[PDB]
Amino acid sequence: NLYFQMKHGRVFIIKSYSEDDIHRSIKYNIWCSTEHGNKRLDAAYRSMNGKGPVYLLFSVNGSGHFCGVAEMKSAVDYNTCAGVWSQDKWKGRFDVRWIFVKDVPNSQLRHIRLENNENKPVTNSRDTQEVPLEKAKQVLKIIASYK
Ligand SMILES: CCc1cc(=O)[nH]c(=O)[nH]1
């Protein structure tokens, strides 16, 4: 209702090519991004210093929908077993906590736009695109109220 109208938290889009990697993340509550993506999330997490959550909005590239919401729950460990994701393109791992597993079609979010990404729809983001807090509130309310 007015729950989401907090003033702390940072929100990022997660774009996965792999449906297998979504399933593994939900099963084991972990994730891994590119090197550049991990560094961005690790900085946001460490600078948050616990004063609020880091939310992750997951969407599989090409699927036409978002598939869930997770919260970051650790910094990035860069020295972990390799080859655990569906493509061996990844060094490291961080903990997440899946908060919401539901398919939300892009049609329900296309009209929200990111002033920090040339006003492109939030549904046209790349991996680890950060969402401004005020637009993030609108997306979460839509996700949590979809049926
Ligand atoms: C390591 C899991 C993963 C898969 C993918 O396709 N993209 C990404 O950023 N992380």
Q: Would you list the DSSP string of 63-116?
A: SSEEEEEEEE-S--B-S--SS-SSSS----BEEEEEEEEEEEEGGGTTT-EETT
Q: Are strands 65-72 and 10-16 parallel, antiparallel or unpaired?
A: unpaired
Distance CA(83)–CA(28), nearest Å, equals: 15
Residue nearest atom 1 of ligand 1, based on CA coordinates: 32
Amino acid (one-letter) located at 127: D
Residue nearest atom 4 of ligand 1, based on CA coordinates: 16
| In the block, residue with structure tokens 């007015």 | 2
Distance CA(14)–CA(33), nearest Å, equals: 8
Judge whether 72 and 94 are in contact, CB under 8 Å: yes
The resolution in angstroms reads: 1.8
Q: Which of 22, 9, 6, 11 is closest to 86 using CA atoms?
A: 22
The 10 Å Cβ neighbour count of residue 34 is 13
Determine if ligand 1 sits within 6 Å of the CB of residue 18: yes
Spacing, Cα 25 to ligand 1 middle (Å)? 10
Intra-chain end-to-end CA distance of the chain, in Å: 15
Distance set, CA 14 to CA 1, 2, 3, 114, 116 (Å): 25, 26, 24, 15, 16
Distance CA(88)–CA(97), nearest Å, equals: 23
Q: Are strands 130-131 and 120-121 parallel, antiparallel or unpaired?
A: unpaired
Q: Are strands 30-31 and 94-105 parallel, antiparallel or unpaired?
A: antiparallel
Experimental method: X-ray
Long-range contacts of 134-140 (CB under 8 A, 24+ apart): 136/9, 136/11, 136/55, 137/4, 137/5, 138/112, 139/11, 139/57, 139/109, 139/112, 140/4, 140/11, 140/55, 140/69
Number of domains in the chain: 1
| In the block, residue with structure tokens 């807090």 | 133
Binding residues for RNA: 15-17, 21, 31-32, 61, 85, 90
Structural domain containing residue 93: 1-147
